[PDB]
């Protein structure tokens, strides 16, 4: 009775939030891991094939962002209160290793400097830059909105993320757009429903 | 105009104490973005940057709370705004301060 | 450090003409890419400041077509290509390349 009707009927929306932190993955290359949607308790860890949408998994980890960072990849989330930690893999979210006693390492996510190696934006437009011999290639005119650039990854699978306005994200390869997504829905509160639906007796004889 | 900016503080001060004012952002990305306090001191001027980042990089001319989302600053009568700004650079930011805040009246009064 | 100076400090102007606010730096703000690292502020009286130009050329969401800039190295020039009522209020520079300023105070006063 199911498989006629399997996902025909079924409305299921994928929401990650807006991103927080966009980590590039070292197997794979196009694909990265994304952490989003932080709280006083969690976070929002996903994985994110970036030459598309697809969200790959998702997963509510309980810590929050600050705690959650590289070793010295293996993403290493450590508690501060205690030192409860876990090790996971990345590119498959295996539980490496776990502890209470230490944690191996921890290295600070770098923050982008995107200005000074690879792009220039002057006249509401946006050139892409060799780091010498700056000869601009791949120019693009810039969307209506633009906030920062999210993720840009110069070797062989080009990508680039635009984060247009304040919560849509725009994905762009070699520059066609590639495509595009929006987390305006993160968290609904309250809901409403509209409705749609269509729109002397002789004379009554003849008639 | 989503990501807006609210301000608390303090009104009254008498000479040499320190000034408590706090913004509380209301919207996505708390991490890539400078944060900025300015001053307008009547008559007609501005000067500071207060920038701070979200892994505390302080720049000066601020403290952070990543748990909730609100930068917080502890220090002459002025008028106080938060901002937001690029962060093109990896530790300088780049200004472009769209987004300000709604502006705190501080008197240093006897 | 950097020093900002703004030529006209009154610029009464009536609606309809062009006008023009210049703006001049003692260091220079060309980064090695090419980014400029200059802003244009425009405060309404009693209001936060608003954004208009945002790294030296570009124009910032949310504004009219009327406005634009133009310069590089030491000189930098807005440019209003229609003046209305609604553009009153006080304009300033801002330099991002190290510690912003706030230089300028220009001061349209469209009541000749």
């Known amino acids: 009775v199911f498989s006629d009707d399997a996902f025909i009927t079924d409305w299921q929306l994928a929401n990650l939030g807006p991103w927080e932190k966009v980590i590039p993955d070292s197997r794979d290359r196009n694909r990265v891991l994304i952490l989003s949607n932080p709280t006083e308790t969690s976070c929002l860890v996903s994985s994110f094939n970036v030459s598309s949408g697809q969200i790959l998994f998702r997963n509510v980890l309980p810590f929050t962002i600050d705690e959650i960072q590289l070793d010295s990849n293996a993403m290493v989330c450590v508690n501060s209160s205690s030192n409860h930690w876990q090790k996971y893999d990345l590119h498959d979210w295996f539980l490496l290793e776990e502890g209470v006693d230490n944690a191996p390492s921890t290295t600070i996510l770098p923050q982008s400097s995107y200005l000074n190696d690879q792009v220039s934006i002057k006249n509401n437009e946006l050139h892409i830059l060799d780091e010498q011999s700056k000869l601009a290639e791949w120019k693009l005119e810039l969307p209506q909105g633009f906030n920062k650039v999210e993720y840009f990854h110069r070797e062989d699978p080009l990508a680039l993320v635009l984060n247009v306005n304040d919560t849509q994200y725009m994905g762009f390869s070699a520059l066609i757009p590639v495509w595009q997504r929006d987390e305006w829905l993160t968290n609904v509160v309250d809901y409403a429903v509209l409705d749609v639906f269509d729109s002397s007796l002789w004379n009554a004889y003849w008639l | 105009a989503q990501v807006q900016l609210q301000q608390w503080g303090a009104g009254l001060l008498k000479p040499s104490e320190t000034l408590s004012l706090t913004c509380a952002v209301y919207?996505?990305?708390?991490?890539?973005?400078?944060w900025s306090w300015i001053r307008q001191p009547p008559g007609k001027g501005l000067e500071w940057i207060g920038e701070?980042?979200?892994?505390?990089?302080?720049n000066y001319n601020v403290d952070t709370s990543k748990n909730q989302f609100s930068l917080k600053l502890s220090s002459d009568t002025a008028v106080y705004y938060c901002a937001r700004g690029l962060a093109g650079r990896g530790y300088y930011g780049s200004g472009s301060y769209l987004r300000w805040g709604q502006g705190t009246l501080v008197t240093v009064s006897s | 450090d950097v020093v900002m100076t703004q030529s006209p400090l009154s610029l009464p102007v009536t609606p309809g003409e062009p006008a023009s606010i210049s703006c001049r730096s003692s260091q220079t703000l060309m980064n090695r890419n090419g980014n400029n690292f200059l802003d244009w502020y425009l405060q309404k009286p009693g209001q936060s400041p608003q954004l208009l130009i945002y790294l030296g050329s570009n124009r910032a969401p949310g504004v009219p077509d009327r406005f634009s800039g133009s310069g590089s190295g030491t000189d930098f020039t807005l440019r209003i290509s229609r003046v209305e009522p609604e553009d009153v209020g006080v304009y300033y520079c801002?330099?991002?390349?190290?510690?912003?300023?706030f230089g300028g105070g220009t001061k349209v006063e469209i009541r000749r």
């Open positions: 701070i980042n979200h892994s505390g990089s302080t």
């Open positions: 801002m330099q991002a390349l190290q510690t912003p300023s």
């Open positions: 919207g996505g990305s708390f991490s890539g973005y400078y």
